[PDB]
C-alpha cells in the first residue's frame, strides 16, 4: 500500500452542525434577501462552531462572516431572535461505515480537530473514538508521525499540509458535502466517493 494512513477532519466531514431552529434561521436570511438553502446554512454554521471563544453556542456575526454577508444591525437582531446560538451536532449516515471500512482494510486513522472538550464529548456520544489511532496547530505532526505516511487527508477545507522533507507527506481529498466548491474537481461529495478515491490513490 502506497498510503498507510488517513487523516480526517471533524466538522462537515464526520459530524455536521446546524442551528436547532434552522428553518427559522433559513427564513430570516431569506427575509433579508438571501435565499440560501439549508445545506448552505449548515455548512456555514459548522464553520462558525470553530470561532466561538469557548457551552458551544455560535455567535451570529461569525455565521454571517463565513457566509460573506454583512452584519446588518437588523439581521443580527433577527438571528438572535431565531436563537441561532443554539446548535446541534448530527452524525453523517456514512461516517461509521467509512471509518470501520478504512480501519478494517488496514489504514491507520488520525482525527484532526480543534475544541478538544466539546469534540471529546461528541466522539464519546457518537462512539467514534474507537476508530482512531491518533487524535490531533502542532499536535498535527505528532499524530502524523504516529499513524505513518504517506497519508491522505480527507477534509472539508483543511486543504494542503506542509510537513515533509523532499515532498509533502500528506495528499488531500476535498470532501464537499454541501456543493460549495463547484470549481474544484477531483472533489468528492460523500464518504462513499471518498473511499473510492482513496482506493484509486493506491
Nearest-approach distance from CB 171 to a second copy, in angstroms: 5
28 binds a second copy, rule: CB under 8 A: no
| Whole-angstrom distance, CA of residue 195 vs CA of residue 182 | 20
Long-range contacts of 163-169 (CB under 8 A, 24+ apart): 169/144
Tell me which residues in 132-191 interact with a second copy (CB under 8 A).
138, 141, 144-145, 149, 157-169, 171-172, 174, 180-184
67 binds a second copy, rule: CB under 8 A: yes
| Whole-angstrom distance, CA of residue 72 vs CA of residue 65 | 11
Query: Which residue, 84, 61, 72, is CA-closest to 33?
Result: 72
Query: Which residue, 6, 105, 19, 108, is CA-closest to 64?
Result: 19
User: How big is the site for a second copy, counted in residues (CB under 8 A)?
Assistant: 38
20 binds a second copy, rule: CB under 8 A: no
Give the footprint of a second copy on this chain (CB under 8 A): 34, 36, 40, 44, 47, 51, 65-70, 138, 141, 144-145, 149, 157-169, 171-172, 174, 180-184
Amino acid at each position: 500500500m502506497k498510503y498507510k494512513a488517513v487523516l480526517v477532519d471533524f466538522g462537515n466531514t464526520l459530524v455536521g452542525f446546524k442551528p436547532v431552529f434552522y428553518e427559522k434561521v433559513y427564513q430570516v436570511l431569506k427575509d433579508n434577501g438571501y435565499d440560501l438553502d439549508l445545506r448552505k446554512v449548515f455548512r456555514a454554521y459548522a464553520k462558525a462552531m470553530g470561532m466561538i471563544n469557548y457551552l458551544e453556542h455560535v455567535d451570529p456575526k461569525d455565521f454571517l462572516y463565513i457566509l460573506g454577508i454583512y452584519p446588518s444591525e437588523r439581521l443580527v437582531k433577527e438571528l438572535k431572535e431565531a436563537d441561532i446560538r443554539d446548535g446541534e451536532a448530527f452524525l453523517y449516515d456514512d461516517t461509521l461505515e467509512f471509518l470501520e471500512g478504512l480501519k478494517s482494510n488496514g489504514y491507520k486513522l488520525a482525527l484532526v480537530s480543534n475544541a478538544s472538550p466539546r469534540v471529546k464529548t461528541l466522539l464519546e456520544k457518537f462512539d467514534l473514538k474507537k476508530y482512531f489511532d491518533a487524535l490531533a496547530p502542532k499536535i498535527f505532526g505528532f499524530a502524523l508521525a504516529k499513524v505513518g505516511y504517506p497519508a491522505v487527508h480527507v477534509g472539508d477545507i483543511y486543504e494542503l499540509d506542509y510537513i515533509g522533507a523532499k515532498r509533502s507527506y500528506v495528499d488531500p481529498i476535498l470532501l464537499d458535502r454541501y456543493d460549495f466548491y463547484p470549481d474544484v474537481r477531483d472533489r468528492v461529495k460523500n464518504l462513499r466517493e471518498a473511499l473510492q478515491k482513496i482506493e484509486e490513490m493506491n
